[PDB]
Design a protein around this nucleic acid. Sequence first.
RNA 1: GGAAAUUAGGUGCGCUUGGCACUGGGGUUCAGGAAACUGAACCUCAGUAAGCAUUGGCUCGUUUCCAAUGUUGAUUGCUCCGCCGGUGCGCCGGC
DNA 2: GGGTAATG
DNA 3: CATTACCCGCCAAGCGCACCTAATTTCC
Length: 834
Amino acid sequence: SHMKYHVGIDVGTFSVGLAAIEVDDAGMPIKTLSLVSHIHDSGLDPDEIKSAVTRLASSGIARRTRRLYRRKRRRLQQLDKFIQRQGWPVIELEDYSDPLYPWKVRAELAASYIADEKERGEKLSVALRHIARHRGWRNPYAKVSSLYLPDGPSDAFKAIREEIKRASGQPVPETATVGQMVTLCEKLRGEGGVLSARLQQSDYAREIQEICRMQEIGQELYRKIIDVVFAAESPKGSASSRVGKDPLQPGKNRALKASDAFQRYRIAALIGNVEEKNLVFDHLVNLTPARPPTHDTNRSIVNSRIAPLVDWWKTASALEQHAMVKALSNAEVDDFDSPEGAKVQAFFADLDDDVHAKLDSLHLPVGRAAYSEDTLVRLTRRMLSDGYTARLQEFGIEPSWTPPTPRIGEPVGNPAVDRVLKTVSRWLESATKTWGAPERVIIEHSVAWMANELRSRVAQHFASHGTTVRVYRGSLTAEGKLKFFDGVGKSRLDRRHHAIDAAVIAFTSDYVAETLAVRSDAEHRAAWRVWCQKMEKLSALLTEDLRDDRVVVMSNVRLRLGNGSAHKETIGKLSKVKLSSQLSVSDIDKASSEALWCALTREPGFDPKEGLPANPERHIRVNGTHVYAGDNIGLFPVSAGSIALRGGYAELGSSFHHARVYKITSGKKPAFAMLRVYTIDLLPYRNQDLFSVELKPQTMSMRQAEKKLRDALATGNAEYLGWLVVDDELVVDTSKIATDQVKAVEAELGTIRRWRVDGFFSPSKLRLRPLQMSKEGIKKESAPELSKIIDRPGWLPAVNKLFSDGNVTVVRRDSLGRVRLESTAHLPVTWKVQ
RNA sequence: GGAAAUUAGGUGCGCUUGGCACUGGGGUUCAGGAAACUGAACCUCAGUAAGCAUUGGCUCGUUUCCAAUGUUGAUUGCUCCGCCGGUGCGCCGGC
DNA sequence: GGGTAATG
DNA sequence: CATTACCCGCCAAGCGCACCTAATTTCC
Ligand SMILES: [Zn+2]
């Protein structure tokens, strides 16, 4: 389009004010193109009760924990295979009748020799498998070899040792293993017994060591046992995948600190910051001996006084010892592929058991450089042959060069920031592809990192079209006569003020920018006269849009199947009932599986009202498994939707993906019901349209549904009209269906016809809140009805009452806030409930 | 304003571990009982999202079974389908 | 904050 | 139908990648 306009962007803590106003050729506002107060969830996990935990954070904890249980099972499987290769038997502890049998064996093995070769191996296998389960803690980067010569007893070991001395009275504070202290007590696990059990793997390795001495087990096998019992993956190269990149040379990973490159680079940087001959002379001394810098890694390596290491350092080539640096640093992956690293790795086998612990005491510098190894070396070479100035000539980079920025929507790692970045990119792209590029983009308001990154990302994005981009401080930003919901001029309750503040921001001249912050030069005064002429012209446009309610308050919706944890974490005991018992319809709907529900509901004696009568001769098949009248079956003890899990059960919670809306034509009068679809009932149909997935009556979603809707679906009197999702926008006529507290809100604040879907409260009730309002605007002098409707729990209308007499329309919008009535791309579309 | 090296500090995540809690199997010892039995402490093993993918099986399941291995399973808010746009069939983005 | 279970 | 009480699993460890803030020397 040939229209010229300005763009104002207001960044809030949980909102984004987006504004674009058509501007005259001189600078006067003409028409408002798009006013949007975009609200976001800050990327937070809804199931974390507002402890400021994002989905990314909780996903990672679940991801790592899920792997932890897998890694723990692999260890115990490998230990059993290691025990069987030694001719020892893998005996289960439930075979022995003594519940404390593993503790007795661990104390017996650490005291005297065991005669029988069979009994000695059977009890060693019992003691080893037990220590592996509760094996204490070690530094994750410390390798197994750090335990071949275990360290002295930990502070926790000494603390527990004195604890038994007090409770038992008879102490042995000398050469006592963990097993033989505990054995004489005859409540360990928990807060009370092991006093939080802040133990160490070295303490358990010491117990294993003494067991090996008593059973005539040399170091050749003790070491091999320590390898298996204390096996663990290392977090060595865990950070190697998320390393930044060189701006000058994109494809190369950033240089690693404590490398011969960076160290020889670093001191070259300081001398340059003249004597164009004596540069290299000074550098020679600085290389090989605020304070001056040095080749810190080489100094740290030699001083270590590790006799076997120092011999390798001089004999190894510069490239060979470069691999030694990567292997010792906690940020690099050991390779075993190149010959160099294979030599370093081969050296890592022959060292004595006393050498290993000395390696962990050594500390190399940690960090990353801005450029990359090849660029690090190349500039020192060019630095040597010269006296920034040294850096310029290497790349043919025009001196004004700054490292480029990614696309606007490129995520940065912070979930709250990535919400804004992706939103601003989407809106500008929709704005650009409609009215072309803008003339000015002005951005306003820890969170300032967003605003800075926006300007940089936006400026490069619009560099071709010559668009000015500016940021301003929040205090300078704030420095009218508009009518909002709660007050005049200013408002914290009305969410439309975010777009209004963004509109004013699109018209802040830089000469006005000085005086605005100043108020909290002759030409500066000429600007103010032009400015007020624009502002007074702008004020009229927003009043109309505020009156016509053209300011759009909106948020995105989440339609994918995955949405946090799929059920509650607490597990409860199931209810077991003999099959011959009397089973009402309520009892059958509490069955722990769908197959059980089908077997019970397909019985001949089943009645849709009375259920199943007591019958000592009823026969039931569940997944080919026959169940007699004398067998127990599992039922949920609660009416809540749940799943059988880990022997017991767990409640599904608020894990609704979407809710479907039905019209029930029963002949009496058309009624409206609602089906809340659980996330779990859409798992087998992940690859389909979730809103068209045929849910079967056996699914929990169906059984938890309003009974009226269930009978209608079984007869064909329920018409699927559409689906709702959390953060969907509704238009509601509250004249006939508003509750008393809603009307009290509406009387004080005006009729509220735009509502937002915040939850699916009951199988028959919605959770709605006013779309354009925020809780922070509720003052102490306000009415208590506002806190009920806006804060908690909100308007909770019945689905049938709301849709029958509310004249409700579900409103979906595009990125510019415009109502979307039809879509070629099969995107969510506005529809009317009728 | 910005960039490099620095000293001080913060935020956000990444990786591997350590303890519990919960449910299930087992076991011992108690409390109360005349007993049958309850119930409580402990100890031990196991599960620790639901699932999805591959392989191989069964009684081959619209009551969707079993076993092994892997898992990015839960960031990226318009699922799926479709059309473009980048990217290393898939990922990201736009409608 | 969400929902369930339980009252008006 | 509307309204209200009450329910939700937690705590450590060492390290490293990213980014930001406040200062000093150069240089753009
Ligand atoms: Zn049968």
